[PDB]
């Protein structure tokens, strides 16, 4: 019911694109973005990670890495069922490209795809983990 | 025969006393076990009746100044009448100098003892009707109500204004026909609004409310093209349903524009109230509606605050003259328990339904506007009950869709029975169905007029008189002479109405049984200490058994039974006349099989008859049942064959013999269709059979002639 | 050129009949050659005095001008993975520096040696390059960059309605809408107002816009949240179409009220989880809810100089504004007081800018109207910076001590703008805290992160060096007439508000007297120095501008306009501003720059701002930057008036003559091209009239003479004796 996705290139970690929104995003973006320089190629393909109040959710495919962060609570397997739709669009779209690039934040357009997907999943009509072990 | 007696009164003066001879003294007055009350149904339907287009005459003494009725005695030739309630007499008008003994004014035929006068005079005010739509609701179960609402206005009259107002987590005052705009008001879900305040936040026609043949295409496709509230709603969470600030801006908004004329605030909850003053209950799922359980183990801190807001809602409506419907279709409990003070004081409707995709709620519906044989609406606005009493008489109260006027005078008993302490009251809301119970007290005949005057659904002024005549207690044969006549049935839904209001705004079966026994004890028949002798006479017997009936009601018997389904069932109770009202009290039972036709049987399990097919009516549901070898027969394809067609008349007789009054009463009742292990069979032995009536019988009988 | 000295009495005709170009720093050419463009950056000082002292003692006042979103003709953009700056100070590698190793380089602002990562280093671009921009890696930012969100809003009260602004503003806006700065994430919103506040949803689902009102002024919120803040790509024909609807809504309201703070709180409300850009357009005085503005009486011109605020509101909104990443920008299309020195408030401490167009009406007055289409046309087509930051960094011994602009100064002194306008100046005074010993050289860097309408993080980085010089006459030959006068316009400004009008007026002449009277006690009449030769004329015209004049009938929204227009405008428009340049526009020759394949363009000698420069057998033309004038001779020739004109005789020429025709003689071609060579120095589109005739109800042409005498003001001469009795007491 309450979001924040972000997809980064899993070797030097630089993003890629995301999704935010507020009516706090300061801390909390922060552990995503030193999670995705920890991840390498030992990494686990997919992960649930937990936190107190909040929860992460991430795949990651063809070399890049489909992290949301969600407000504890809310259904585990359908959050990966958001990120498969997006990694669909992502590797359809831009997979060919990703490894190209360098600029944060290359693909930002791929916000305008985010917002329509993901709420089309708030309203209702693996390996798991604490996040302060990992980082 | 005093049978007779009973029926043609009520089908011309719409009236049900509980008993028409009233005690001469107050020896017997105060020893009036059953109180002396009516049934009074001020606008019962007349087949020949002719409304008089006439000012109607009045009496010249400042305090009477009732009307000239069959009652007041004339002098045809010295022009004069004497009334008779206080004896004053009376000069005759203009118009009735050229009266005649054989041409009489109407008004004094005992054919018009009710009559009804059409006082044209000001210019007629439109009629108004506020659609307060909820948008939390299902895509389905909220498009079956756009069609359902616009179906409404192709039967609403060319001059009548219109407004609407959807809500949800914000309420949205739509301001109407703006071209290329479509505009709306919009207020927190969360502050309550004074009639001033919504009139300075905003500003015959308005623009919110609107003539409907200047505005009828563009609210149509406002309704055609509504949506759900666009707030999204979280997993775990109900919407935020801001009903209570919603209903009182709708109050508010018709308060600072048209006080003091018929309209209807129709309101319209797909779900409870979340949010706001009059909440029901929180956003979580998780803690869920308070059941009669909760509330009585005190677990529901949302109905007593929720209760008070609603409650002085009706007063500020039903005190402007605005009438609140409440049509409530959902799954989950929605808040009938709190918001019922509307509906109830104002004389507004109150509607239950699963889903209002519901062929049953979208019927229900448009018989809200079934006109009689002119093309004009059956409901009327605005009525003004006046009852004036002979010297004698005193009005303890009335239970009923009304609210006090308190005007005072020596007509006024003290001895407040719930609405008492006037002799003025004022419907919000009315339909010749209407009926209040009008409670009276002793203190030659005995005379009572009802003067009710209404808004027409033809926007005509009309005003309705009923004036009744039943004849004082000879005191040598005092007692004897009343036992004949009591109105059993008329008596049993009169103290039945007084059992619920004491309920409802709280034992009860205690004061129930006291005046079962009390009764049993002064009219019939028995010796001391012996409980074999004890006959009732033909007029009482029927008591007992509805008495039976009336303690194991749902009306008493609130538990198995949510708040909201006990506030909607005793709320047609208090407004039903006597006939519908027995219904409900006691079930009606007919019969079908190859043995025997249509004939009403004994609801008891000796009469759950395997080999037959029977018909229960309660008022609110109309069931249809098959027996062991009833059922079985029809899991056997057998029904299917040609050479037995006795079948098929069989189990399509009570089909059409409920289709009949499936069309009639007016919240069409729950249509079933159940056999043995049938899951909705339950019902069929709940109201089937202290314990069961026998036994019953004998407990009163062994009291009845003890201790007095 | 020239150390040589200047006697303003006898000579009289000082100013140069070429426009004046800005001073060369006294330095070596091999780093001369680098220093930034002077339109960019620039010193009221080329050279700099080395102990606060000495500066103190040419009461000269050190400071500098920028105007760093400049729209450029060719600008390096190095995507440099990694970001090579200082270790310490964490300034920007300038070509400045001092390599020394080829592996180590001395940082030229807090003289700290660092090592150039493996990344000839002395021609990399970073080095080659004075204006060049950075993209910013990712820890150089809080968010993803931001879509771009311009949200507009409306007064449409009575008096609104009867200007008709809302007619041109919305066929701006649909001429526009593709030229709006952005990609595909575009967001675009909608709001009026009059005694209520009014939203606007726009979704494919039904047929219209919805209108959602606000009638809790005292309680502001929003009704939807989606449709108010729209994609402007695919939700394009539903924002189109409300366009074409808005201007016909109120054409009859009888709302005299405006709840114009309770619209903007709820404004601010709606796009403060993305901050963006907020155009908001007024017409009167506010007089409903919080923001609440008494009205207020004009002092004529018998009033002593006797500015400020009426309430903090409208500044603490802008705050809470800028914390968002949300700029306001004022379009004031008033017809009377509206208390502009409060509501201005909301673009100073926001990034924003201020847009003043005195009685608008889309009849009687179609000057404004056709200045409202020009200067939104650069509104809204100009590059737009979102989520900006600034720091401007100076080299150890001197402090920056004060700032002048549109922006909000944090801790630590960060210019936190909102939004980077393209078209804004920004000014600063520094001194020396720390004596200059050690070093022959300064340097001086601003940065300018920001988010572009492409959705990526840029820094625009700009570096300039100077020398430093350790005698009284080596400052002023390298002094800086223009951006003096500008340093001391922004200063003065602060100062009518610090304290009082007079108080303004009087620093700005004891800058002229306390400087020479220090000069001619450092070697009969007026000395100034060649550089100084045009500071007491200047000054003179700052006193004329309608910021700081006296004795005339100005109007207080029209002054604080003529403020806010200091603190926000770049050098060279204040300058045109204040000395408008006129020009010999009757009789075009051709020793001018003509060279550009087919075209003709005199440059007619910039002529000195005196009626006895006129002469009414002619027609002169006046360049205010801003706009254009051409004064038309009564008794003029009438072969001008006949083909340049097309008019028989000046009495036939029409009252409002919005521009000229396009005729077919060599003398049309004329004085199109050189008005075309006037407009295209300028990116902000200029109208020209020739209205000024001998009555025509216009001659305020004469208030910008600033040379001549009044009723009111003294003349150049008689200002050049009031100076020279106070050099000499
Ligand atoms: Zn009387
Ligand atoms: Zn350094």
Known sequence: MVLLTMIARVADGLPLAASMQEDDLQQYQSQAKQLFRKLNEQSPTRCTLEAGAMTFHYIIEQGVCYLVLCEAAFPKKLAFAYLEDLHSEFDEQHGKKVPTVSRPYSFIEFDTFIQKTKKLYIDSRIMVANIEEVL | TYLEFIQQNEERDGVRFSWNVWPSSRLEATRMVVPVAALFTPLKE????????????????TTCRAVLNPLCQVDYRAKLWACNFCYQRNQFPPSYAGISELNQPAELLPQFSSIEYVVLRGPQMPLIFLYVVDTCMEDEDLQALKESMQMSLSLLPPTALVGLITFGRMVQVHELGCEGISKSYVFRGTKDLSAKQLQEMLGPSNRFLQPVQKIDMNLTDLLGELQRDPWPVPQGKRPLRSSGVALSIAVGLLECTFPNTGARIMMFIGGPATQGPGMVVGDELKTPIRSWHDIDKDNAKYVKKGTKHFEALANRAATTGHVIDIYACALDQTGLLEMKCCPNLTGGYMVMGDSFNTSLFKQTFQRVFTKDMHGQFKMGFGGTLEIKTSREIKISGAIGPCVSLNSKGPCVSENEIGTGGTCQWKICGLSPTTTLAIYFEVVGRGAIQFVTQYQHSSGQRR???????????????????????????????????????????????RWLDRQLIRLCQKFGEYHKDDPSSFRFSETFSLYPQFMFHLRRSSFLQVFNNSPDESSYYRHHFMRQDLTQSLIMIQPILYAYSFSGPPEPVLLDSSSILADRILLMDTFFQILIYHGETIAQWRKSGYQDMPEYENFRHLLQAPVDDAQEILHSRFPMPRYIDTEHGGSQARFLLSKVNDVSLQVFMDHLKKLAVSSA | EGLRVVNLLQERNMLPSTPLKPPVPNLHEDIQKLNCNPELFRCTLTSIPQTQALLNKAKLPLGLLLHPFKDLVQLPVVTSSTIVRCRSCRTYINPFVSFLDQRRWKCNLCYRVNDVPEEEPHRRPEVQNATIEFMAPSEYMLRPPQPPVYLFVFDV?????ETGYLNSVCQSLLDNLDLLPGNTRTKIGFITFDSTIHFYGLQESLSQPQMLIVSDIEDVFIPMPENLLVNLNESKELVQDLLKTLPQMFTKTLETQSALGPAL?????????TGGRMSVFQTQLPTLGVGALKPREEPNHRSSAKMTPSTDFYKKLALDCSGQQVAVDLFLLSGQYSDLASLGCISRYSAGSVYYYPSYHHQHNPV??????????????????????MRIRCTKGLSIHTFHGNFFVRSTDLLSLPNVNPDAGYAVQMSVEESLTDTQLVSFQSALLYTSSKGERRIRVHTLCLPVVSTLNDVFLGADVQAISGLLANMAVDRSMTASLSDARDALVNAVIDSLSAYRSSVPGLMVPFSLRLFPLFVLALLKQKSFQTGTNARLDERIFAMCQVKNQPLVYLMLTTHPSLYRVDNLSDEGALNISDRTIPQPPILQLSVEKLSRDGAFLMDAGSVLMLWVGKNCTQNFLSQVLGVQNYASIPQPMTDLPELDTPESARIIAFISWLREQRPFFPILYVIRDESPMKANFLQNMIEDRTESALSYYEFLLHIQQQVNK
Not at chain 2, 46 to 61: F, G, T
Not at chain 2, 473 to 496: G, H, K
Not at chain 3, 265 to 273: D, E, I, N, T, V
């Open chain 2, 46 to 61: 007349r087949p020949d009746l002719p409304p008089i287009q006439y000012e109607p005459v009045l009496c010249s003494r």
């Open chain 2, 463 to 509: 005003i309705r008189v009923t004036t009744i005549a039943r004849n004082w207690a000879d005191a040598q044969t005092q007692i004897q002479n009343i036992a004949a006549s009591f109105d059993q049935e008329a008596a049993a839904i009169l103290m039945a109405r007084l059992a619920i209001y004491r309920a409802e705004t709280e034992d009860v079966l």
């Open chain 3, 157 to 161: 009260s009575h008096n609104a309605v």
């Open chain 3, 265 to 273: 709180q709820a404004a601010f409300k709606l796009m403060s989880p």
């Open chain 3, 368 to 389: 404004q109207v056709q200045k409202l289409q020009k200067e939104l046309q650069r509104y809204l087509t100009r590059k737009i910076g979102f989520e900006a930051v």
